[PDB]
Design a protein around this motif. Sequence first.
Motif, PDB file in Angstrom:
ATOM      1  N   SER A 121       5.857   1.930   3.484  1.00  0.00           N
ATOM      2  CA  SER A 121       7.209   1.385   3.408  1.00  0.00           C
ATOM      3  C   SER A 121       8.271   2.418   3.765  1.00  0.00           C
ATOM      4  CB  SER A 121       7.476   0.832   2.012  1.00  0.00           C
ATOM      5  OG  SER A 121       6.589  -0.228   1.714  1.00  0.00           O
ATOM      6  N   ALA A 122       8.023   3.687   3.479  1.00  0.00           N
ATOM      7  CA  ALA A 122       8.960   4.753   3.775  1.00  0.00           C
ATOM      8  C   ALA A 122       8.499   5.546   4.988  1.00  0.00           C
ATOM      9  CB  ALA A 122       9.111   5.666   2.571  1.00  0.00           C
ATOM     10  N   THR A 123       9.178   6.659   5.246  1.00  0.00           N
ATOM     11  CA  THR A 123       8.743   7.622   6.241  1.00  0.00           C
ATOM     12  C   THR A 123       8.516   9.006   5.659  1.00  0.00           C
ATOM     13  OG1 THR A 123      11.026   8.142   6.853  1.00  0.00           O
ATOM     14  CG2 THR A 123       9.905   6.398   8.100  1.00  0.00           C
ATOM     15  N   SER A 124       8.557   9.156   4.339  1.00  0.00           N
ATOM     16  CA  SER A 124       8.361  10.467   3.740  1.00  0.00           C
ATOM     17  C   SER A 124       6.886  10.832   3.759  1.00  0.00           C
ATOM     18  CB  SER A 124       8.908  10.499   2.315  1.00  0.00           C
ATOM     19  OG  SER A 124      10.320  10.388   2.313  1.00  0.00           O
ATOM     20  N   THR A 125       6.607  12.077   4.121  1.00  0.00           N
ATOM     21  CA  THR A 125       5.261  12.572   4.334  1.00  0.00           C
ATOM     22  C   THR A 125       4.942  13.648   3.315  1.00  0.00           C
ATOM     23  OG1 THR A 125       5.909  14.380   5.769  1.00  0.00           O
ATOM     24  CG2 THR A 125       5.587  12.261   6.791  1.00  0.00           C
ATOM     25  N   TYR A 126       3.661  13.942   3.195  1.00  0.00           N
ATOM     26  CA  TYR A 126       3.202  15.208   2.661  1.00  0.00           C
ATOM     27  C   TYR A 126       2.166  15.730   3.643  1.00  0.00           C
ATOM     28  CZ  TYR A 126       1.861  18.768  -0.684  1.00  0.00           C
ATOM     29  OH  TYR A 126       1.621  19.964  -1.312  1.00  0.00           O
ATOM     30  N   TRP A 170      -8.631  16.984   3.427  1.00  0.00           N
ATOM     31  CA  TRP A 170      -7.586  15.980   3.538  1.00  0.00           C
ATOM     32  C   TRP A 170      -6.387  16.552   4.283  1.00  0.00           C
ATOM     33  CZ3 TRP A 170      -2.721  15.948   1.102  1.00  0.00           C
ATOM     34  CH2 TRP A 170      -2.057  14.728   1.113  1.00  0.00           C
ATOM     35  N   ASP A 214      -5.059   4.702   0.655  1.00  0.00           N
ATOM     36  CA  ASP A 214      -4.964   5.484  -0.559  1.00  0.00           C
ATOM     37  C   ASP A 214      -4.790   4.548  -1.747  1.00  0.00           C
ATOM     38  OD1 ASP A 214      -4.799   7.609  -2.240  1.00  0.00           O
ATOM     39  OD2 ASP A 214      -2.985   8.458  -1.364  1.00  0.00           O
ATOM     40  N   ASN A 262      -1.026  18.942   4.201  1.00  0.00           N
ATOM     41  CA  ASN A 262      -1.814  20.028   3.643  1.00  0.00           C
ATOM     42  C   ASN A 262      -1.187  21.352   4.071  1.00  0.00           C
ATOM     43  OD1 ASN A 262      -3.916  21.458   2.448  1.00  0.00           O
ATOM     44  ND2 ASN A 262      -5.535  20.522   3.666  1.00  0.00           N
ATOM     45  N   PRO A 263      -0.925  22.283   3.143  1.00  0.00           N
ATOM     46  CA  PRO A 263      -0.295  23.556   3.536  1.00  0.00           C
ATOM     47  C   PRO A 263      -1.149  24.444   4.424  1.00  0.00           C
ATOM     48  CG  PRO A 263       0.130  23.117   1.246  1.00  0.00           C
ATOM     49  CD  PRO A 263      -0.851  22.082   1.687  1.00  0.00           C
ATOM     50  N   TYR A 284      -0.409  12.321   3.835  1.00  0.00           N
ATOM     51  CA  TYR A 284      -0.181  10.897   3.689  1.00  0.00           C
ATOM     52  C   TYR A 284       1.155  10.465   4.266  1.00  0.00           C
ATOM     53  CZ  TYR A 284       2.178  12.212  -0.786  1.00  0.00           C
ATOM     54  OH  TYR A 284       2.980  12.771  -1.739  1.00  0.00           O
ATOM     55  N   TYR A 334       3.893   6.901   3.505  1.00  0.00           N
ATOM     56  CA  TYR A 334       4.124   5.895   2.485  1.00  0.00           C
ATOM     57  C   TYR A 334       3.960   4.462   2.951  1.00  0.00           C
ATOM     58  CZ  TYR A 334       5.729   9.093  -1.037  1.00  0.00           C
ATOM     59  OH  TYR A 334       5.796  10.063  -1.987  1.00  0.00           O
ATOM     60  N   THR A 385       0.787  -1.233   0.000  1.00  0.00           N
ATOM     61  CA  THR A 385       0.000   0.000   0.000  1.00  0.00           C
ATOM     62  C   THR A 385       0.822   1.286   0.000  1.00  0.00           C
ATOM     63  OG1 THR A 385      -1.718  -1.228   1.132  1.00  0.00           O
ATOM     64  CG2 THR A 385      -1.948   1.112   0.992  1.00  0.00           C
ATOM     65  N   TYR A 386       1.270   1.687  -1.189  1.00  0.00           N
ATOM     66  CA  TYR A 386       2.096   2.859  -1.475  1.00  0.00           C
ATOM     67  C   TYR A 386       1.820   4.117  -0.655  1.00  0.00           C
ATOM     68  CZ  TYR A 386       4.389   6.404  -4.392  1.00  0.00           C
ATOM     69  OH  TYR A 386       5.170   7.433  -4.855  1.00  0.00           O
ATOM     70  N   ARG A 387       0.567   4.419  -0.314  1.00  0.00           N
ATOM     71  CA  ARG A 387       0.291   5.562   0.552  1.00  0.00           C
ATOM     72  C   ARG A 387      -0.791   5.233   1.573  1.00  0.00           C
ATOM     73  NH1 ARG A 387       0.485   9.041  -4.304  1.00  0.00           N
ATOM     74  NH2 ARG A 387      -1.804   8.841  -4.386  1.00  0.00           N
TER      75      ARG A 387
END
Lengths: 480, 480, 58, 58, 213, 213, 242, 242
Positions: G55-60, G48, G100, G62-63, G51, G53, G32-34
């Motif tokens: 498998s990773a720890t990289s986030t995005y 929203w 996601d 909402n600004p 998210y 990832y 599950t990529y996100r």
Amino acid sequence: LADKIGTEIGPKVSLIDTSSTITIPANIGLLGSKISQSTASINENVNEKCKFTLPGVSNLVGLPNNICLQKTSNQILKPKLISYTLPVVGQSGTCITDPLLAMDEGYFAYSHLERIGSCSRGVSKQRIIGVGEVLDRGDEVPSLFMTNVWTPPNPNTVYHCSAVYNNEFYYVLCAVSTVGDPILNSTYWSGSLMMTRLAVKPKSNGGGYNQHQLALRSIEKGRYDKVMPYGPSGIKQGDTLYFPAVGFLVRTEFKYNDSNCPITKCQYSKPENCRLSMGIRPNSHYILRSGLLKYNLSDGENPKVVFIEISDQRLSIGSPSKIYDSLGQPVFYQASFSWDTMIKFGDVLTVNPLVVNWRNNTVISRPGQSQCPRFNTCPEICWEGVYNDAFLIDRINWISAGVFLDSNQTAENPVFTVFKDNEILYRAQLASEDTNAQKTITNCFLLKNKIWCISLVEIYDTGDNVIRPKLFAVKIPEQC
Amino acid sequence: LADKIGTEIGPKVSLIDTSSTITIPANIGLLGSKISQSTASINENVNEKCKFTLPGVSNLVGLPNNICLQKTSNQILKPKLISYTLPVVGQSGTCITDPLLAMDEGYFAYSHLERIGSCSRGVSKQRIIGVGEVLDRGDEVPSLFMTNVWTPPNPNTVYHCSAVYNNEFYYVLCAVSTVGDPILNSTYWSGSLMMTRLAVKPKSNGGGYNQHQLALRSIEKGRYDKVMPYGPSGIKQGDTLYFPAVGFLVRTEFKYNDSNCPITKCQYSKPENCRLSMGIRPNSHYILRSGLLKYNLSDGENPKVVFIEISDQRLSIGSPSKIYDSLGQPVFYQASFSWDTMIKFGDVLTVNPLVVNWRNNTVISRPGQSQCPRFNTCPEICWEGVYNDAFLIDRINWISAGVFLDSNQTAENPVFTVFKDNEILYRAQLASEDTNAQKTITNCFLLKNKIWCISLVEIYDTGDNVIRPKLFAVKIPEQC
Amino acid sequence: GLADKIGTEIGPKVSLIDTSSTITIPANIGLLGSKISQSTASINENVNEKCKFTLPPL
Amino acid sequence: GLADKIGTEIGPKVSLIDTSSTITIPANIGLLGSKISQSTASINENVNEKCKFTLPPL
Amino acid sequence: DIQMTQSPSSLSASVGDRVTITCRASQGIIDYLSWYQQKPGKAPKLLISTASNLESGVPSRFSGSGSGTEFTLTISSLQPEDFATYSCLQGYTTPYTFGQGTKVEIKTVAAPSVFIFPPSDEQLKSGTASVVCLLNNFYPREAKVQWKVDNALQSGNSQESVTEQDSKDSTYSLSSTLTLSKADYEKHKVYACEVTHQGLSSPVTKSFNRGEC
Amino acid sequence: DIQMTQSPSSLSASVGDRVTITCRASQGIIDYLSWYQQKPGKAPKLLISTASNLESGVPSRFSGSGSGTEFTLTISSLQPEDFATYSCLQGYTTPYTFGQGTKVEIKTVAAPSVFIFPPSDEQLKSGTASVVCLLNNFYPREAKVQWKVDNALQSGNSQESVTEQDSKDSTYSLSSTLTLSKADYEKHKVYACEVTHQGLSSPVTKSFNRGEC
Amino acid sequence: QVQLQESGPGVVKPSETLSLTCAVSGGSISDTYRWSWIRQPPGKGLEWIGYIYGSATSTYYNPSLSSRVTISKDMSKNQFSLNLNSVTAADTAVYYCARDYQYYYSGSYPTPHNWFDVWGPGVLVTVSSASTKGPSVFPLAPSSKSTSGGTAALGCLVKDYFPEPVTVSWNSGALTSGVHTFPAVLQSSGLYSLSSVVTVPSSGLGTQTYICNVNHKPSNTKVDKKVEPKSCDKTHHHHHHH
Amino acid sequence: QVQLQESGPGVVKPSETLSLTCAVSGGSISDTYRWSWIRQPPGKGLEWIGYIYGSATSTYYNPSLSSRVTISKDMSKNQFSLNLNSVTAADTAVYYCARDYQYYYSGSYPTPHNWFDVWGPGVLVTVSSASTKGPSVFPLAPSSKSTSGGTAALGCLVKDYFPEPVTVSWNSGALTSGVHTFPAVLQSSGLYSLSSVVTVPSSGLGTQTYICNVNHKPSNTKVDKKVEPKSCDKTHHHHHHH
């Protein structure tokens, strides 16, 4: 669904009509014009810049192109439909009348009056008048290719066009008539002509080059009250054109010796019929006297169309004449619209004044309707018949060729015959036996020292019930 | 009125469809082919038979074609739509995706996957794959002219074509896939390619001459489990072709040093992202490694497609690569489908093995969607971005040119920029500001010692709501 | 069924024929005229170049 | 009024476009290909004839 | 960011109507759009992805079309299992922005039977007095309530609570509270509540007196 | 020659019907055809010339189309001034040949009131005796009459005369004559005439006896 | 099928750290990529957050919530958290966790269609400074003015509790028809209060027992209050002592 | 307008020369390119004979009648004749003279559309060897068997005359309703005979006088015969002389 057809389909189909029947064939024709103009330009460039120093299609010319000169009954002729490259085939509701086909040195002409519905009382839709090029397709077989196409703005007022090639241009002479067909409404015809030059090799922006419709402010008539061109093709003598014509002579001025009316072998004919059948009706005000239109281009900016009358030897009513330069000397067909139902064509002895050595033929005649059928020589008052010309394909043995309607009265069964003056040599039945037809126009030429012939035959299609001009490229065979 | 539409209008409109969208443009293209084959034949005939004794469009070659090398803000570029000569414009219900444009020595290629309805989930209607000729119209402006057009019999099984010109033929290599797009369904892809030769100058009856779709019974892969061509255009080295590609390496075999992941200037990036963003998903079974396909024609009847991998310097995920012979030496664009959102194109130092001197550019980037936007160099796990290539138009000052989408995340506003490696010199806004776009393919060449450039820009038309590839012939100006 | 027929097998197809008949095929015929002019000027400059004789008397 | 429209401004006009598009214009393009071949063979025989040098040594 | 404006914010239609819900975007997304049916008290459910796809499990009465800036969520034959919150979502760029939502109601007009309740004596012992005016089984939900205290409108002491639409008789129940103190309850006699409603031609006003039992 | 075969030879239609009259030719005439309406006792009148022209004076209900071998004379709204003889004419070649003609009748069915007349005594003095059987106001005109003499059919002595259709009640009148001698009149008793008709279900037979007055 | 489940406090005082958890059942987050988070303010639309990832720890993020939201991870216990810092009353929402999903068409085009397929059941988290308090229940007694066309209504008035929700059933869950438990409103004092009534036939008043059964689990308060008509005669018997 | 008018004998014995004349009023035959003749056999269709030019003397004739028909002329008296020789009984017809008309379309096409615009009123010419004879009139007396639903019919039986036509009117032209004068048939003896009846109400027998008024002009015969019922009582009074 009235809105979709009225908006998204209707005007778009009108645009596809205008495109793929006006501007795409005119651009393919102008494209072929640029092919041929380019080839002439590079051949002139080679003849200049490679002429070092030291420190197709052409008409019948004087070469012995041998053909079959012996009568056979075997089907040695093979007709070929080449009508598909033209705007012959309209829809099922248009009749295509008043045609033309006029070839000289490979560059033809073609006009037709497209009507709506019935062939007689229909409304004139348009009048294509378009010159082109006679070619060869990939089978050593000729076929037409229209480059330049013009239509007059008022199609109801252009009658009886005659069309002569002249030096990489094409000069087509018609009759302006606001009061109907000037043969018919002759007393009220305005007596006005118009000439439309066309170029057989048009250019990209040749506005005044392609269609420069000349005025005619001086017509040399003579005795004749009115003069109208009448017949498909003509000849050129250098700068001088010769449109076939007719001249409306007032009957009270017409002087004719009734002893010359050949009532010798015939008993049902007065000697007073040969004068009265010179008009379309024996009390008509005018009399049709066929002839020529000497149009010399050397008269300046405003030339004069001079009417040359015909010699009175074997004289009958004005027919579509057809003078044509075959084997060097002009040959003058002049149709049988009167009592003289035999074919009336011959070599020209002199052009001005017109004296035609009429060939004494007795095997070729045309179907007349009521009084003057096929093979009638009794002088009877009629204006009946059809146009069935003949092109001289051999002068050494006096053989000619054309499409003729082998029936007595019903104008049907068009037959491409190649005939001597006293015996039909061989023939090709172009269609079925009861295929009704009309005016046929036969022009012949040389494709690589082979005599081919293009016979525009108006065949009535029994399928969708209108008349279409079907061309027939017929090779005159050598092996019998 | 069901009978008239079902019989007299329906099948006739189907015939007009087939004619004026298949067989009339193929015959006009074959007509232009005969124009050019004829001109080559007569020029060879002149070079033989006039070489006495004594008793156009070409690609960027090494001539100093001077262009504007100074940064301006004035609109000195003038884009020109030349998309109208192609089958770009379908109806309002078709989206035109998966394009191609591949020029070398004047003979292009063009393919597109025509869908039905929406651009993503639509049904593939057809796939034109058609080569042609780059010309000049009457205004010193180039324009395309398709001569030869081919479609595969099964349009759902032709993916990711790459197309290289080779010696008056055109060799287009695609990927047969019955299980969907092999980037996506990579574990179940059959691992089979097909090459379709086309002739840029087709002939009348060239059956096995025009489209001789070759088999590929031997693919030199190496470590890589599968190999697929991936990218629009390529180069030739004599008889040797170089299709841009990608190679599906199993992740357990992929060996990468995590110390090389540039996390120096960035804090939101582990050194474990540069390995995991080499696949489309960080637990995917395969890893996309871009490269080339050495296809030498000198191997006999059954040649071998050899996969050359790329050098690991500035290594990211497999993108549509585009090697192109500009100014003599091949230049290798390779798009930014990963964290390295700057443009990644450069001169090729050596082709086998592929080592590309990547240009250190910092003003040209592509719009990524979510994680990796325009101007991101932080190593983050993403497979995001679009294809925006760049053609080297000047090597002396290292100036290149292409269409780039000037927005951070929304893939909109395609801008034809001409840029140095550290400053955009000048630019042309091809459309409005919120004109959504996609993949742009820029190819440049010389038209009479003038550098013109053809940028196939997929502009989303806001009118009828589908994506169309609009070409843009943009002249690189000399006067600033 | 008549509206589906006229918006399936007529409407888009007549729009396709219109695009192919007043935009595409006239432009290909115009560029083919440009090809005739290019080919003619090319073969004329080939004749003006490669058919040229000059020699002084011995 | 829809039948009169489709038998007036569609039916005969679609039949006219069909005749003009699968009989007339393909035949003109085929004869134009024949014109290209005729023009090419004509200019080749013009070059084979009118570009020919022979001279014996004095 | 991309703003997703829907129109209308709350649409009302009977069972079997053709319902078209829009979601207009600020920047032009190509077709990167999804439709969500959020049932009350439940998680949202994906209906129509990529603005034209019927998802596996969503019935054929839901259809979607439109791309660019204007989008259409079309419900052909509206059913009683479809009266919920409909939301759009753009996926073209990130932050993913939903629309404000579309509330869908059953067009069955019914008139309320208005009730009123005096405060209990134990509530008067508690220190406050809340007059409660009741409006059961009405439609539309948008109505008007005026608190009248000795024939004088009071504003600033009203808290209203209307339930979500029942699945039995497809109407609404209202509950408004006039929170007042004990002394201010004893300072007045008559406590009235005015009901302005579509099905009610005259304003129905229920009232009671403090000294009357 | 050209034979002009029409179909049908006699057509019958009510007022306001769509009447299509054909005229098929043997050799194909192009469109050289004219239509003639011959009223009874009058000269023929040109209707439709060249197979498609409405002539000046012929009303718009007459229309013609067709060419080649099949021709159509179409009467759109049939009127009571149009029940006459319609003929085609070919003008393509000579002898001009007309068709056989088309008779047009009014489709109004009526039953006859059958009468019979004994011969007068002065006619018996003249030497012959003609029994006359009368059939007034019937439709269709094609009927069947059998002379019966002492319940025996006689054939070879019958002369029938039916009028053209009246313009008042649109029916027909029949008159059949059994011409017999005086002695052969006295050799028999009963003289009957049988009427077979469409509107008459049973064969109506009127008779009389010689000895009965 | 992957089945999500939120967990966390519905009671968070303002200017604090929300500590949610969407533990994943039926699937691993190594797939599950996100994985996202979505909140929904009641009375407003969905929006929203951000998210992670898996498998990773990289986030995005909402600004509009960029400087606040932290999404942490736990690969072992198959759960991923949410840390909204400096919470305000306008952050009262239903924080859905969502799986996601990406639709890549034509993998020379890496811009997927994005949507969410598997949502959690949601959790109502209200930012409130109030303490947990049991309700006060007083009956809405029927009167002569509580009649309308043979129908006489009665109910209970729930007041002054925290947090949400209460479950107010009628006569131990036997009474269902006519039951209308209203949603609660937030008072000016900061405590919740809802109403709950039942509309019965007016001939049934005096024969049937109606008791509302209130149950508030975070304060452990169970109240059963009977609804009776108001007595009117017991006050006017003033004795005249002669 | 040009108005035609035939003239000639309706009585021509067989194997003789018919001598018709269509004199032209309203126009000269020096006009009008053709003038024709058309006959129509009764019981059969129209068929055309032959034309004459008016200004000329050249003829055409139908090849089924080629060796017989002569069409002569008179320019002065504006008339043109017809001479059918060796007439038979099958040449019994109505000989119309007709002005011929030609529609020339496009006068490089001399095949006109041919039709006839102005026709003469026609003349009935029957080839018969019988001599002119007046009719014998005997009444069709009404009987008890001459009744049908309140209607009783009566008439006159005309017999043995020549030529056509007779004009049989009823009661000096006063009786019009119910009048049916039948067309005549040719007997085996060669003489004409028609019937003529009137159908009157059966209550009007014995009160109204009904007399048929026969007028035959080529024989100059006028017959008035009264129709009366048959007497039935005058025969059975045989006197018994005792």
